[PDB]
Amino acid sequence: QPMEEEEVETFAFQAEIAQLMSLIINTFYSNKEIFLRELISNSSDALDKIRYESLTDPSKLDSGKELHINLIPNKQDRTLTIVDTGIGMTKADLINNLGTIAKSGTKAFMEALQAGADISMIGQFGVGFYSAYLVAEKVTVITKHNDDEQYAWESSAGGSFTVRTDTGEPMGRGTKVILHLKEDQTEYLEERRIKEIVKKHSQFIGYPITLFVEKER
Numbered sequence: 472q473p474m475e476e477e478e479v480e481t482f483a484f485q486a487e488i489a490q491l492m493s494l495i496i497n498t499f500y501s502n503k504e505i506f507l508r509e510l511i512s513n514s515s516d517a518l519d520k521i522r523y524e525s526l527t528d529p530s531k532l533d534s535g536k537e538l539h540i541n542l543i544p545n546k547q548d549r550t551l552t553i554v555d556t557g558i559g560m561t562k563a564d565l566i567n568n569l570g571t572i573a574k575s576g577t578k579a580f581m582e583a584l585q586a587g588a589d590i591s592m593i594g595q596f597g598v599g600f601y602s603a604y605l606v607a608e609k610v611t612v613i614t615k616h617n618d619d620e621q622y623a624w625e626s627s628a629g630g631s632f633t634v635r636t637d638t639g640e641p642m643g644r645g646t647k648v649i650l651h652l653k654e655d656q657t658e659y660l661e662e663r664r665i666k667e668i669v670k671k672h673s674q675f676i677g678y679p680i681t682l683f684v685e686k687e688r
Contacts, residue, residue, distance in 0.1 A: 479635045484570045487577040488601070489630045494581060495604045496628055500590040503656070506606050507665070508672035509599035510553045510648055514540045515676050517557025517646060524558065534617055534644035539679040542669075544660040547688055549652050551659050556645040559616035562634065565624055569612065570632050574598055604628060606659055607650035613637055614646045 484492065518538045525531040535556055543552040560568065576596030583592060593602050603610045608627060615621040621641055626632035650659075658664045662684045669680065 477635060477638065479633050480566075481631055481633050482566060482571050484626075484630055484632065485573045485577075487573060487581070488570055488598075489628075491577050491581055491598060491601055492604055492628045494584060495590075495601055500605060502589055502591055503605040504659075504668045505591045505593070505672060506602040506650075507553075507659070507668050509594050509602045511540060511669070511673045511676060511680070512594060513600060513648075514553060514555035514557055514646070515678060517555055517559070518678050520558040521556070521644070531617060534615075539681065540676070542665060542680065542682045544662070544665065544683075544685070546657070546660045546685065549654075549657060549660070551650045551652060551665075552647055553650075554642075554645065554647045556643070559645050560614040560622070561616045561619035562622050563619075564616065565612070565614060565622055566634055569600065569624055570626070603648065603650055606652055606656040608653050609651040611649040611651070612646065613639060613642065613649070615642045615644050617644060 483489075518540070521531060522538055538556055541552075541554045543554065544550075545552070574597055576598055580588075580593060580596035580598055583596070584590065590602065590605065593599050610626060612624040613621065614624070621637040621639075622634055623637040623639065624632055624634050652659060662682060665682055669682075673680070
């Protein structure tokens with residue numbers, strides 16, 4: 472059949488974000504497990520936004536009433552996926568919030584980290600997303616907001632990310648963060664380890680969380 476075409480938009484990370492990513496990637500931190508707490512917290516926040524929005528306008532849940540979080544480890548692909556049915560992101564929200572716009576806490580957080588702060592402090596500085604890079608060599612974010620189409624963001628750091636219209640599995644609404652794990656971080660695909668960390672750091676959450684455990688492949 473003829474050659475297909477797809478548009479891709481490649482963006483440069485804001486300089487301090489790029490520096491933070493570099494620091495996260497290329498420096499040893501213990502306690503890397505907090506990446507999961509941070510992504511769950513972001514899903515919980517996203518779920519809060521759609522829940523409150525929907526109080527006033529219940530048609531915001533036409534894209535699905537269930538408000539929850541699924542964790543999906545895949546040993547074959549070496550990916551841990553965190554899926555929520557939260558508000559999601561429009562394409563503008565995605566490009567804005569995940570890389571191009573300076574974030575208030577980047578500078579202060581890098582100074583803290585160097586000065587010896589535990590990486591666990593990252594969430595307090597509003598840049599918790601980037602803790603993904605403690606364990607993942609590449610992150611893909613799939614997102615669908617009621618007001619826009621489904622988009623895929625991805626980055627392996629190196630100072631750039633891409634956004635394109637997602638040609639993968641449509642979602643009704645929410646965000647899916649796919650962590651392509653580093654070879655030495657595969658413990659985060661083990662159900663016992665995931666359960667240990669969720670229990671330890673994510674007892675707060677306010678929505679149902681479900682771990683899907685693979686039994687065939």
